[PDB]
Ligand binder design. Structure first.
Ligand SMILES: [Zn+2]
Lengths: 46, 36
């Protein structure tokens, strides 16, 4: 059950927004990664 | 100098990514002594 964001540093699926901060959960680190779609992406191998 | 939760070691990797300014601060040793 889900993903939205990631901790640049302490490596750990976060998931949060607005009035929420922009920090973390078991690293207090202020940099955050978006995190990959599940819509599947295709490549031509050319 | 933070937004909130305050004053922290900064590595160069993070200053780059947060648009920070890899800075340290300056401290003198001051003296009051009286003369007009
Ligand atoms: Zn973290």
């Amino acid at each position: 059950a889900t993903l939205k964001y990631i901790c640049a540093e302490c490596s750990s699926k976060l998931s949060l927004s607005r009035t929420d901060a922009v920090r973390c959960k078991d690293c207090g680190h202020r940099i955050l990664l978006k995190a990959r779609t599940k819509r599947l992406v295709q490549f031509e191998a050319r | 100098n933070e937004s909130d939760g305050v004053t922290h070691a900064l590595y160069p990797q993070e200053a780059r990514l947060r648009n920070l300014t890899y800075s340290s601060g300056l401290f003198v040793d001051v003296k009051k002594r009286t003369y007009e």
